[PDB]
Amino acid sequence: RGYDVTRNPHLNKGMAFTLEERLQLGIHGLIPPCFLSQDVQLLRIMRYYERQQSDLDKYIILMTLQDRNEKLFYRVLTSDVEKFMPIVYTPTVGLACQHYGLTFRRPRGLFITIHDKGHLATMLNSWPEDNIKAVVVTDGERILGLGDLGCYGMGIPVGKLALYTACGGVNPQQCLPVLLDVGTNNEELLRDPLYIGLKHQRVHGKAYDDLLDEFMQAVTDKFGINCLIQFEDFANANAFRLLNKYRNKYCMFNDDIQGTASVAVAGILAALRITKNKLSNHVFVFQGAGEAAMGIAHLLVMALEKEGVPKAEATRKIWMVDSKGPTAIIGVAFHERPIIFALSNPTSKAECTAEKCYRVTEGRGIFASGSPFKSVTLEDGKTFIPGQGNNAYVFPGVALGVIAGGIRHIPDEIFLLTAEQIAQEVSEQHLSQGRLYPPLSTIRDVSLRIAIKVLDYAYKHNLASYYPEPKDKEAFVRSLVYTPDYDSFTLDSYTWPKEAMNVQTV
Amino acid sequence: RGYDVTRNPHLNKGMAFTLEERLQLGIHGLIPPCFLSQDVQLLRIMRYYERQQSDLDKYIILMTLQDRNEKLFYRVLTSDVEKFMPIVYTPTVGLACQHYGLTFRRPRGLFITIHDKGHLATMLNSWPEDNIKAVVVTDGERILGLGDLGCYGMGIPVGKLALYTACGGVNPQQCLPVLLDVGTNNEELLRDPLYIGLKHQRVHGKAYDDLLDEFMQAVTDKFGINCLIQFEDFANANAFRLLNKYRNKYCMFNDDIQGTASVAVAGILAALRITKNKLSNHVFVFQGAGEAAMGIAHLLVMALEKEGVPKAEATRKIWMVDSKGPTAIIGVAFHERPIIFALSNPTSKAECTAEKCYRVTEGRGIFASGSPFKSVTLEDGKTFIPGQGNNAYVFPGVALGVIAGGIRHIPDEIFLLTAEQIAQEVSEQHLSQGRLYPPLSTIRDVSLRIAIKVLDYAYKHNLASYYPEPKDKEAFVRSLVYTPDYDSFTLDSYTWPKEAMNVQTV
Amino acid sequence: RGYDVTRNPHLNKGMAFTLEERLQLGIHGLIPPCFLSQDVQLLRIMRYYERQQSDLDKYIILMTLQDRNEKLFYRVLTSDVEKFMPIVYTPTVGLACQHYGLTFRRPRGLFITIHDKGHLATMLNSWPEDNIKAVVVTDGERILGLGDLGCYGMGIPVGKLALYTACGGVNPQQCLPVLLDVGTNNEELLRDPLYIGLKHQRVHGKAYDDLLDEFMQAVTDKFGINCLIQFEDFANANAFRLLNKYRNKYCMFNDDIQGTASVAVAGILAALRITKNKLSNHVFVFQGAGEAAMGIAHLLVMALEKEGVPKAEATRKIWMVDSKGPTAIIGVAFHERPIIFALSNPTSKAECTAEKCYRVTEGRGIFASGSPFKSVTLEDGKTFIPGQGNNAYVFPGVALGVIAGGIRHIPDEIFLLTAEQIAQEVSEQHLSQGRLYPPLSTIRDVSLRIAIKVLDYAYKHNLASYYPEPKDKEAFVRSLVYTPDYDSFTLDSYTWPKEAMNVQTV
Amino acid sequence: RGYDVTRNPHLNKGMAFTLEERLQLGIHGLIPPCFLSQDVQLLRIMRYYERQQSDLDKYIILMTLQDRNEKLFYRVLTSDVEKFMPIVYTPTVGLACQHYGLTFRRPRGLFITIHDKGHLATMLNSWPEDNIKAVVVTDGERILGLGDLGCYGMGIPVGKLALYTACGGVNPQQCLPVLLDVGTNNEELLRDPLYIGLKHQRVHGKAYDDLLDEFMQAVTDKFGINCLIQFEDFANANAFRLLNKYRNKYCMFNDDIQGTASVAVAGILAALRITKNKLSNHVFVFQGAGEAAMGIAHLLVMALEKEGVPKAEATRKIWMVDSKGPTAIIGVAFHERPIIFALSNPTSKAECTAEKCYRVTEGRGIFASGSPFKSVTLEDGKTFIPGQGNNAYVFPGVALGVIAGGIRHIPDEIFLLTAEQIAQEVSEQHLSQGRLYPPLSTIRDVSLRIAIKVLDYAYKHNLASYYPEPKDKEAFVRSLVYTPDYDSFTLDSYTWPKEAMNVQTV
């Protein structure tokens, strides 16, 4: 296998191929005559990356790195993941999606069209990898903040899958980004000459649903019923409907619904680690009961149940207010330490400023947001580093645990225990600064722990299909955690005793 | 052949693959669900290309296009070749070479090192294409204007090979860019951490020469003695020595020596088309007799001989002046229409300003340069569009004629008749504006003509090895001219009479 | 994929490729210009096959067919399987094994040597198929009747795997024949110059065992813990030891031990279908208690337990006699219908002649053998077609059920219910002739039923790992039954509405 | 490249792969654990080969060897070529052709049908090798002795190509056997259910001719005008017509016409080496002037011309008698040493018995035949080993010289000088026994010499296209002579100085 190795991003090491490797692979001459470690390659990529004057340019550099040398791509990511997550995934990935006609380099992923109904198995055969354990599929209809972007949203399952690997350690060769193109209702794309999608309105109803049914059937026929299928930015009602439809038939989840709710409940439990009270000692007023607070309320009721409180009064503790009409305030549209959750994305759609809370409540108010908020310079001297609830706290570790143990379905208990682990992740010195989530530089480790917990759950509820149940699940998950470290392409040469390998010259 | 087709730049058409082609190639799903002609792809590439604020960025866009979709790359080039020649080749390619550590995307070409002495055949085996008809090899030692750039000069044989295809129509799959890395004497690269080459001094003498001997031997052993081997920016003395060594042993030429001289003689003959006199009615004073004016003087003497004038007095007509000591003045360091040739590159190293000549000589002076010179606004009203002598007038057409007819060696007569054809290319209305060279937008056609002439010569002097000699050489060369038009990847399905293709069910 | 298709036996159809298929596969011209159905190909193969004057020649023809066109090979087999089972498998395969140095055509299978200890994963990587669901491994040490044949015994896992497909419908591409060469103690092979194996004595003890441990580990690391690993002709004590070692750690079984016992118990239960009594109404005297009657006695005790009779007296019903010291007599070394089982292979090592029993017992004696016995011409007029207990009644259907449902381990209950199904297979008109086993021409169907039963068991005892449990297991097993029918290699071409597939010419 | 190497007959060495080679090729485990030299493999093949009781069985063994391991196949052939020539080629190949429906193993060659008119380039693309330097094409219409065998005659270009390699040393990978199926007029094949060809009458006239024109055009378009195209057993008139048509347009010859004539003239000149006279001292009576003696007479006239005798009287020396009406008697239907040539094939169609000549002429008669004739036991004591004129004396060496030097056309002078070299090959002690041709065990050497002579001719008449003309043509031809010796598949690993190959860990 010669020149084709330098064209495979999973194999190509660039100038990190040693001379022995280049000679054994038949690629000597195709690479410049220098031999680099991955550290030097990282430094060179970083120099080229810091010369860009845009997040779009940085994104293009990272995507070219991904399609050249993906071990180096994930070395770039897993080195300062907090820096590259905004560029590879939201927010920058949404803007790149907005500008994919202009900035269309090599295409990545699988584009499955409504007009391919009946032939999705062949389209799956078109993907080069055959051992696919995770599929992130998007509709393109509700790209975060940007609305309908159909067939430009392909950067979302790609970017998100990068976070599967960067934050979780999921093997990138076992990941399949899919965009289901059923048309778009975005009028600017129907007229855009650079638009790469179907230029008609979105198909919906008994053709959309049958396309999705055939997609799930084809994916689990080719890759097995254990294939994790995550649904990306679908429309809200459509997303919830598909979640309820496929949740128990397949190994699917929706990170926008279940991951967001899990992060919110994680923040609430981390705040309880400060209020020193039980979840039963809390009454919750929600502010955005528009399918977003529904997941938070359900998972919070489930946590109240698990700590002992039966369903009815656990539901009595929730006061969901939206446009018609205490201890914890959560918005997605009296007490010593009130819990205020902004949880709204664009930093302008929000409930507070992380300084409004901390300067109005006299600083004795535990704030959390889904929007980036700089530290506080409160007059008394309290600093109050405010924590941000990233969805990357949930889906990488959950996906790693589900892929590791072949978990067949992802019930809500998985997400509750994920929230519990994320709550336990926060250090008391971080809680001293009002920080409700672990730092992103720890996400790998955090993911690992979550995976183990998820594994520990799935075996004790007969959900894990991997056999036999590993006695030590930490080392089993660690054996599946993908690392950006290069493999050795040198050939394992050994010999036999010099009487078995004797060439007979009879 | 599925996903690998989208990774082969010679095959990949991107969204220009039709649905039938995508289904037949097993690549359906890998491409966005839109179907474009090459015109729409060109418009999209041009939109992305005009958004760049640098020639380096434009160069990077074009090189990414080349390694994605090379039919589209050559469609971009052959559309307004005058615009993209400065970016793909000199001057911009030299600056990119200066910045190849920073801007190192996918590597192209073959890097053959002095330490590979004895194993060059294996390195040639490393190149994916087996039918190589043109090899542009560089040392990296005398990159135009930039000096020693060793192992950064790989962009020079790549860029130049692009001009082989864009300007000449040479098949890009039959072209092999080679950089011979023997070390570098550039001290800034020996310390540069981004440097991709050997970090020692240049090897020279009986090891350099044996490396070059083995390189020529290996190239003609793998690709045949008819393989055209062009020597790129070697050191001046080294370049001339290698030219004289390999000129009659192989199908080699040096475009810096022979191409430059041919362009200069072409300009001189085009100027004679204005002075209305014979070449014998001219006495030539040279100004830069430093191996650069030597080729011009030799080829000019050869032209004087061919028009009738024997060698001795033809040499008597040349007055080469440099630092120790009429009708035509040529510099590379009385009469009605004096011929002034600047021929110096950086527009600052030169002999005139194309306005100094035209305002001092009262406009009755035929000027030519190797430097870009804007038009003149002379007070009387004479405009005087000054022509520029590009090396792309010579090497593409000569290479096309040599590859077409399997010409075994390229004598100086080839370059003289190339200069004669280029002189004949200029229109009388262009000569009315003082323009000595055809416009670059015509280069393809010009190359074709040159090829035919070269072919016509090689057959009548028993130099063309292609058999049988085509009766109509224009259509034979046209059958080999590569075009950026996409091929059809659909399968030629036919049937037999429905008694021969009957399936026997005995 | 052109010429390589005609070299792949799983793909190559020979002259059964249609013209459309030949043109689409790029193989047109490589095949003679005739188009045959598989029926005509079968007739041609049969004509060539009936021209041979030896079972060795017939075997060579069938093995060449297997390595040319394996769909046609299995069409030949599954057509009159009773005729080709003696040639593909025992007895003829043993004689071919004896003569593999002389008759060494293309090698099939994987040869793993004791000197490969530590590198078995790479050797498994050497096998072209990656989806292996059944591995038949042999030591070569106890080839049936022939003794130690080490590294000539490779025809045994090959032949047996053929029966996996011919009799069971197991996919042949998911089958891997392995020979573990640890040397041989056969002195004639150590001196044989045609011998293809290690020419030293058998390795044994802590190196043999570690080689087997690494083999099981490597096979289940590459192909999954669900890979069925059948142990072939190992030495008796070695075979039983390995069975007990790996029985619960892996999905392994030994067909010589468990399959033989299952066939014997099947014959006993079929005979009970004639004696009209319960198994509790029988006392069993065995004659060959040398690890061969042990399995029969254990499985018979298990059947007595399952019908109601507790362990102690169920064991009291067994009288195993060998060299020191009624209703049923079984040998592997009073009542209305005595049951006499010869069960000994070479027709000379046996307990009766199938005529001795029927002429001495006055015909009222139910005889079964493991040796071929022609019908009886008893003086009264009773014909008494005597049945033969083939191991192919057990292992194909059990393997099909285990591969279908991903059964993790094969307990003895699987083999008991297999024996019960085989007993139920016999028709009452066949029991009227004293025939205790179904005819081999039914084996496919029989295998299917066994598979379903095995499946039905594994799900109700939480042994089947395939998910979800199919509601209709017959159609699920039928979907996995491999058939010799050719697939269509024509490409599924469809179109989009002629507005989505419109090529944009903007 | 793993398992595919064992499936490529040009690469596969079987058990001759060393352990290092098996590990480097990723084929370890696919081969039995023994390591053989080609001598041991030859001995094993010979043991299996001498166990056959038919020339048809021996032929099948050799063809299976050819499609398994072609270096070993040509080692078998080039070892005792006199023994295996009758089996690989005529006479046995004709009988195998008669029995190709019964004995149809793996197909070899390219079947191009009349119904493929217009698509022969695609069919040539179907052949796996791209560097084809020799094409033996047959019609199947005049298979030697057997008549029309259409599409069974494919064994003739295969067998003959084997002799290209075995006797000449032509590279087998550069050889392409083609059968042009235009139907058959053999009535037994039109009804034969095993027949693999077109079951209609032969196409002829303006469709046959256009198919042949497109075949020659396609072969020289894909493989170059230097591709040697030999026409095999075409019909006599058709063969001569095609020879005259394509002789000067392509590098074609007909071995049945020109090779036979060259062998006959070689025998005549060798006999002159006994009669001690000049060719001008001979008058020739022919007996079979039916297009077979025409070539002999033309080449003999050419030899008379070359020795000095002008055309007219040189033709006066020929007396061609057939059914209407001295020194040399030649049949294809006074003096001290009369020359009697039987030259008729089936030993029953002939002019003498090689004993009739030697017992009637009193032993002083130089006999030659085309039929095998055992030695003579003449009463006086003279032994008279009679020589046989094989066509393998001509076509292998001529083909080697034509492929070596890229000779563009094969004029009759090539065949005359071939006859002269073959005449010179005979030793005087062999001439003492009345043997007119060199022994076949020398054919390789003989071929070499012929090649050199042919090369020496083609350069001095400007027929050789290979450049540059090698100063020593013996060593140039020897560098192209293919040998059955195995290549080494081990990888050439070298290192750089341990400062150039230092991995930078900046």
From Swiss-Prot, chains A, B, C, D:
Active site (catalytic residues):
Y89, K160
Q: Is Calcium a UniProt keyword of this protein?
A: no
What is its cofactor? Mg(2+); Mn(2+)
Q: Which InterPro entries match?
A: Aminoacid_DH-like_N_sf, Malic_enzyme_CS, Malic_N_dom, Malic_N_dom_sf, Malic_NAD-bd, Malic_OxRdtase, NAD(P)-bd_dom_sf
Write down how the cofactor binds this protein: Divalent metal cations. Prefers magnesium or manganese.
Q: Does the keyword section mention Nuclease?
A: no
Mind listing the GO biological process terms from this record?
aerobic respiration; malate metabolic process; oxygen metabolic process; pyruvate metabolic process
The record's section on Gene3D superfamilies has: Malic enzyme, N-terminal domain (3.40.50.10380), NAD(P)-binding Rossmann-like Domain (3.40.50.720)
Tissue specificity annotation: Expressed predominantly in organs with a low-division rate.
Keyword annotations for this protein, in alphabetical order, are:
Metal-binding, Mitochondrion, NADP, Oxidoreductase, Phosphoprotein, Transit peptide
Question: Into which family does the record put it?
Answer: Belongs to the malic enzymes family.
Q: Any idea what this protein is called?
A: NADP-dependent malic enzyme, mitochondrial
Q: Which organism is it from?
A: Homo sapiens (Human)
